Amino acid sequence: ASPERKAAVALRSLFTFVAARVVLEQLQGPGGPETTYNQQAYLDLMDFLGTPMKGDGGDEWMAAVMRKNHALALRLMEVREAYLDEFEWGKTMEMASRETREANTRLMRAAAM
C-alpha cells in the first residue's frame, strides 16, 4: 500500500470515530436518552465503541452496527460523510509540514557546535 493509501484509510477510521462521538453526544439527552429509540441506539453505540474499528476506514465496524441498528448506522454514515466538509485538511497538512521542519531545526540546532 502507498503512504497516501495508508494515510487515507487511517483518516477514514478517524472520521468514522468522530462520527460516533458526535452521534453519541447527540443521543445523550440533557441528562440521558429520552426516547425508547434513542435509548436503544445509545446502548448499541456504547457496546460497539467497546470494539475496535479495524484498519479499513471503519467499514467492517459500520456493517456490524447496521445489522444491529440500521437507523443508527444511517445516522453514523451521514455524519462521517458530512465531516468530509468540516475537517480542515489544509490545516492538517500545514501542521504536519511546518512541525516536521521546526523539529528538524530544533534537533539540528541542538546537536550543532
Binding site: 477510521s13 460516533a20 462521538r21 456504547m46 465503541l49 467497546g50
Partner: peptide
C-alpha cells in the same frame, strides 16, 4: 461509563 478514545 467509558472514556471513548481512538
Amino acid at each position: 461509563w467509558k472514556e471513548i478514545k481512538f
